[PDB]
Symmetry: C2
Subunit: 262 residues, 2 copies
């Protein structure tokens, strides 16, 4: 494929997973805890977690479509006694790196989106433990909420980079929202979830509105940090998808040129 | 460079070394030993060895020009925290393979042309040892000629392939006019020179024209085999030069596409 319309006709459209990820980000952003505004109790807003499922499905599907297109291009290329022109293997190697990057990013984005989803899930569930008390107070069963948060921390997704992955490069690329082991195991830094957990009072806590709002503001600060981490990684994923499109345009042009000069 | 005129404007013109090699082949082909035709002694024709020098110089110059153009293209290409697009290194790798092939072929063609030259030289020098005897006979100082031939065999050029060279591939590419060691040392098979050497009578040999012509025909058969070996390798070199031109056209197109999509 040489144009964007050509790419879509070959079954690849990066706008699909990128928009579904954007929708998931908007869903996360929309989540709100209960509050008391000028004295009236306002129910929170919980997350429709299926938006996150839709994003995970689209990211998986896009990676499959990308791999399929590379496989077709590779087949096009492959395609004393004069041996096969070395440029053909060279381009196959470039294709192989492309396949690795597709897979890596799909795995990383799947895992991070599952994490993002699980944070949305806990921030929805925990609202059952915040309620109106008296005419001007809030009750927060914070011990129950700590347990919910710890359940998330305990089950954070891990991801395995492709064999041969340049670990130093991936550490730079992903940043410190994750850790990567020397064997390519990517784990999610639990620091924001820990800060959220440690902010909570015990069960049965009764707070005046002002103290509740101070806590909610701190909690939201951590929530917004997690949203920023995911926004950042979705932007990097979008750059990868742009790189893929450019790779295909390069390979298609190469194949065209080699066909004319054949 | 995207067109052939563009390549020549970038300092690369494969026609130059290829034509100088063709001229050397024609010079070799033109060599003829003395003879007696319908009773009259006909001087042989010796080789202008400078034609071979011109070819060696042109092959060296072409390889330099090719490397220089690749170096310029590489510079054009080179050119959390989002890391450099992997396609750039991939194309650099392809360039690196290109540089290796240029060097390898230059070394092989230089050495084989030196060999070819040295055979032309001995086939010229040896004519001093063939002369008219009587009205109908030829005298051949064949021992002196054996010594000249052995001097060539003893000083055949050797060539070293680039480090990392795929030895099995190069053995297939070059064929059995050469041998290649597991360490990439290319040596020239002396079999035709040995057959030429072993065809010769001793010093002072006096032959009737018919016996001389039988010997000359056998000698020429070996000479023509050596010409065919070199013609074959020059054709393979021409294919390499075509591959280089295609490589540049591919890389230029890639750089163009990546510039538009940047």
């Amino acid at each position: 494929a040489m144009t964007d319309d050509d790419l879509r006709a070959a079954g690849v459209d990066r706008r699909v997973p990128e928009q579904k990820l954007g929708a998931a980000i908007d869903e996360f952003a929309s989540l709100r805890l209960p509050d008391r505004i000028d004295g009236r109790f306002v129910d929170g807003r919980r997350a429709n977690l299926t938006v996150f499922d839709d994003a995970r499905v689209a990211v998986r599907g896009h990676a499959r479509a990308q791999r399929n297109l590379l496989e077709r291009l590779e087949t096009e290329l492959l395609g004393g006694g004069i041996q096969p022109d070395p440029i053909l293997q060279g381009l196959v190697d470039v294709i192989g790196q492309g396949k690795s990057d597709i897979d890596a990013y799909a795995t990383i984005v799947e895992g991070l989106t599952k994490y993002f989803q699980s944070v949305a899930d806990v921030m929805s569930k925990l609202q059952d433990y915040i309620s109106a008390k008296d005419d001007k107070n809030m009750k927060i069963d914070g011990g129950k909420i700590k347990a919910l948060i710890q359940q998330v921390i305990d089950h954070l997704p891990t991801m395995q980079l492709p064999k041969g992955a340049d670990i130093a490069r991936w550490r730079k690329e992903l940043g410190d929202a994750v850790s990567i082991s020397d064997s390519g195991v990517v784990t999610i830094n639990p620091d924001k979830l820990i800060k959220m957990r440690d902010s909570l009072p015990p069960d049965g806590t009764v707070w005046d509105t002002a103290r509740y709002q101070a806590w909610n503001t701190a909690f939201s600060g951590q929530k917004d940090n997690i949203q920023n981490d995911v926004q950042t990684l979705v932007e990097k994923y979008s750059h990868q998808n742009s790189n893929f499109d450019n790779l295909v345009k390069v390979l298609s042009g190469a194949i065209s040129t080699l066909t004319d000069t054949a």
